Amino acid sequence: SDYVPDAGHLVWLNFTPQAGHEQGGRRPALVLSPAAYNGVTGLMQACPVTSRAKGYPFEVTLPAHLGVSGVVLADHCRSLDWRSRRAEQLAEAPADVLAEVRGKLGSLLGM
């Protein structure tokens, strides 16, 4: 597989290893960084998806037609080695989901 995650892709990823309250487990992830970075580093910035939604504003819902259950945890973005954590492409999020996640994460990061 010559797959390289690109921005807006939803991929399956192992968020374990993690520490403490960091998100763990194999689950979908929304990729924010572009393939040009992801392919030259082997790393990406991505947000985990959970089915255990608490309903808070930093959870961004995925439209049902994508076939991916759960919500994007916009505040849980992290740098991830997507080959070690075995990324597998799943879907592509619509532009408005990507923009909403970025706006909320940007608020968190002080941008």
Add this chain to the structure above:
Amino acid sequence: SDYVPDAGHLVWLNFTPQAGHEQGGRRPALVLSPAAYNGVTGLMQACPVTSRAKGYPFEVTLPAHLGVSGVVLADHCRSLDWRSRRAEQLAEAPADVLAEVRGKLGSLLGMS
């Protein structure tokens, strides 16, 4: 200790556990998220620091007077449990360092 990291703080932190090419090890970190978030979640967004720069543009040099030497790796920001990874405050980064890190990380994340 009742310490809660705040945006701009430089803290000592263990970036291990990690996977693969992710940054690991005990080292300073620049906190980007605010104490209001960090204190309600027990998580924070922070970038690791290395004292051995590779010399690439997303590294942001810390000024010498801080007592924390090296470069902030702006592209390696991540959500971190700062209690599990044992954050300890070391210093406070100046505003221009924080703004430069945020501008570079924002470009990585695809923001405006």
